């Protein structure tokens with residue numbers, strides 16, 4: 001049982017949950033790959049044992065493990081798989097798995113919220129325009145005039161044979177990525193590839209730096225067809241700075257809903273390739289990674305020129321000074337527009353509070369240090385000096401290949 | 405069969421084939437990762453194969469692998485372990501082995517410099533008094549009036565018959581930390597214990613925040629003896645801010661030379677428990693860690709307060725703003741005083757060049773992401789977006805238990 005120490009207070013705990021599940025990760029005694037983004041790369045006899053496990057702790061979590069419906073719900077499942085080969089989850093199991101996957105996501109820092117998750121059952125889906133309205137209800141519910149609410153909508157579980165539901169966008173709201181005469185980009189370069197497939201399926205492009213891409217949705221077998229998003233529905237915040245009057249004139253906006261639409265939800269040994277979850281942003285994701293990264297909008301030196309910073313030497317810390325202000329403008333703009341947002345300090349302190357909660361409840365908590373520590377001011381936040389264990393529990397959100 | 409490592413800023417791909425000959429195993433398993441742990445751990449025949457591996461290494465580097473001179477040295481070493489249970493490194497083998505141990509140090513971002521290491525051979529050392537003067541000369545050569553040089557002094561190897569030479573101090577230069585009436589700490593809280601020791605070994609303590617500690621030096625089988633560093637040997641730097649002139653009224657100072665003194669150097673199976681080494685500082689170690697860590701000097705709030713930042717709420721990002729200016733003051737103070745120093749932008753940039761040199765040469769480079777990435781402004785640096793394989797090669801610097 002790993003001795004996990006916190007170097008700031010001195011506290012000692014043991015992660016006893018690290019032993020309680022496996023799905024083997026990347027590291028071996030001869031090298032750790034914890035810093036890698038994808039763990040390497042991406043007859044149903046024990047679909048039962050994955051469902052045996054899930055149902056077993058579902059009843060553990062409501063006391064009623066032991067007799068009654070517990071030793072009874074074990075039978076409906078094994079009977080269902082006996083003659084069907086797959087099975088259906090009771091609607092509360094779906095809600096409980098949906099929340100457990102969140103609780104288990106090692107890379108997520110906002111898990112203090114894991115128990116407030118709105119779960120839209122959409123397994124009754126089978127059409128493209130159908131999904132699109134399920135998405136569009138999600139977006140309106142989650143966005144909620146800028147008082148954001150965690151939400152996931154679960155689309156039908158991939159069945160043995162016959163296709164999958166899949167969203168071709170990384171997120172519901174993504175900006176345009178337009179190449180040109182330079183092989184360079186105006187817009188967002190993370191999404192250059194999907195702008196390829198948007199136009200390749202009938203999308204007429206647009207202006208430039210901030211074009212909200214169209215959803216590319218596909219229902220089993222039938223190929224993907226595009227879908228446009230109502231501008232009345234994609235809520236967005238224009239970026240301004242409380243004291244640098246010129247920041248607004250840079251014409252920067254970012255959207256409000258972080259909703260990732262390409263991961264695969266696994267509950268009780270069923271795989272849901274369409275399961276968009278949605279929360280609210282931590283400020284650094286917008287200010288530091290999305291805007292400041294050299295392979296994203298890369299605004300850093302442009303903001304530094306406007307601040308009159310000495311860009312002639314790295315020891316001026318001009319990159320650091322401008323990054324902070326970019327972050328200040330993000331929090332400020334979202335607060336003016338009354339859009340839910342959290343700063344990395346507030347966020348990390350809540351994760352520390354979560355770690356304590358999980359300590360008494362499950363004797364531990366899987367966490368990926370390199371994703372929990374914010375991409376600026378890391379050592380200034382209480383999670384930096386806190387050791388962390390990373391493992392794979394189920395239910396969980398996983399990565400999956402793209403449809404090409 | 406080797407890990408694929410991606411740079412995400414740029415999209416570079418290589419495979420770390422060097423990790424295959426990892427000469428010892430670490431703390432991770434496929435069940436769970438412990439890469440963020442600070443301390444993972446805490447006869448003639450293996451000593452033969454270790455030493456065999458080093459000799460092979462040493463002779464490849466002088467491009468004379470598998471010569472008579474090479475088979476002579478192998479046959480010599482086993483002959484001497486037969487007779488005595490140990491062997492002796494030739495001076496050239498010692499220099500190479502100290503270089504490689506630096507080269508292999510996965511948590512050092514300074515490794516671009518690994519070939520330019522001044523190795524002082526102190527293996528003929530005899531007393532704890534001789535020990536003191538080998539160290540003073542080390543400090544003098546490495547300090548070099550502010551124009552810092554990298555250096556290591558190797559005291560005699562561990563061997564059966566007598567005990568170890570040991571330097572008790574974690575670093576050659578450290579400031580005292582005094583417990584208090586308030587239960588608090590005056591000075592550096594990282595050094596309360598070594599301060600407790602010095603007092604009870606006769607040192608009459610001061611009552612400042614920046615009192616340089618004496619050396620507790622241990623000759624084999626003797627108790628440790630106290631030695632005062634000559635003041636004019638310890639180059640110090642008063643910290644000033646280039647545009648916040650009230651900063652100099654804080655009294656803050658740091659020393660020029662970081663000289664790590666409590667690590668074990670291991671070469672071809674032989675162990676040097678006393679082999680202190682020194683380089684120059686990266687500004688973040690002083691500014692962020694030593695000065696801003698809440699369990700260290702903890703100046704952040706008092707600086708932010710003087711800056712007239714809004715301390716009531718974190719969304720103002722006061723912590724980040726105070727931190728950046730504390731760093732700017734360190735880089736400025738050290739450049740004013742003509743004392744070598746490197747900022748985290750230059751340091752991570754040269755470490756990326758090292759990674760590229762090291763992939764062409766050895767086919768990989770062991771590195772601990774959580775330590776390579778600076779404690780502020782991570783994603784502003786190019787090491788953030790670089791995947792890294794962590795593993796342990798020999799020769800090596802290892803931790804060892806405190807001798808008390």
Ligand code: HEM
Pocket residue numbers: 098102105107108109110111113117150151152263277278279280281282285289342347371397
């Ligand atoms: C409501 C507040 C939330 C916050 C502040 C938050 C924040 C974050 C952050 C900051 C990261 C990774 C760091 C980065 O990529 O920049 C992350 C990752 C993640 N979060 Fe959360 N999130 C929230 C809600 C949710 C919800 C509701 C779910 C699912 C039900 C979720 C699941 C995940 C997953 C799966 C990842 C991993 C992404 C990947 O591996 O690519 N999060 N989250």
Ligand code: HEM
Pocket residue numbers: 502505506509511512513514515517521554555556681682683684685686689693746751775801
């Ligand atoms: C000359 C410039 C050097 C620089 C700029 C440098 C920088 C650093 C930094 C910043 C860290 C730790 C990161 C942190 O804790 O904040 C580190 C760790 C380390 N360095 Fe270097 N270093 C230098 C020279 C050397 C030399 C000369 C050696 C030995 C020959 C060395 C060996 C090590 C080792 C073993 C560690 C790990 C210490 C531990 O595990 O606790 N470095 N270095």
Ligand SMILES: CNCC#Cc1cc(F)cc(CCc2cc(C)cc(N)n2)c1
Pocket residue numbers: 037170171258259260261277278279280281282285412
């Ligand atoms: C190569 N790595 C780059 C990347 C990435 C990434 C992709 C995504 F689709 C979502 C997020 C952020 C995830 C997130 C999710 C939620 C629910 C909230 C939040 N604040 N961030 C990051």
Ligand SMILES: CNCC#Cc1cc(F)cc(CCc2cc(C)cc(N)n2)c1
Pocket residue numbers: 007442662663664681682683684685686689
């Ligand atoms: C709990 N973790 C906090 C920390 C730390 C730290 C630990 C160490 F053992 C050495 C150094 C300083 C390392 C160093 C050595 C040299 C020679 C140069 C340099 N710039 N830094 C920092």
Ligand SMILES: C[C@H](O)[C@H](O)[C@H]1CNc2nc(N)[nH]c(=O)c2N1
Pocket residue numbers: 007384385386387440441442693774775776777778779
């Ligand atoms: C707990 C945490 O992993 C540990 O304190 C490490 C993390 N990485 C670090 N990285 C640097 N550069 N300096 C540090 O002190 C630390 N501390």
Ligand SMILES: C[C@H](O)[C@H](O)[C@H]1CNc2nc(N)[nH]c(=O)c2N1
Pocket residue numbers: 035036037289370371375412773788789790791792
């Ligand atoms: C190479 C590195 O591990 C990788 O880029 C990780 C590191 N930390 C991150 N942190 C955040 N917030 N987002 C990321 O995509 C990453 N990526």
Ligand SMILES: [Cl-]
Pocket residue numbers: 258285290
């Ligand atoms: Cl994003």
Ligand SMILES: [Cl-]
Pocket residue numbers: 662689694
């Ligand atoms: Cl230090």
Ligand SMILES: [Gd]
Pocket residue numbers: none
């Ligand atoms: Gd101007």
Ligand SMILES: [Gd]
Pocket residue numbers: 647648649
């Ligand atoms: Gd001033």
Ligand SMILES: [Zn+2]
Pocket residue numbers: 027028031032033034432436437438439
């Ligand atoms: Zn690992």
Ligand SMILES: [Zn+2]
Pocket residue numbers: 379385692693697
């Ligand atoms: Zn620290």
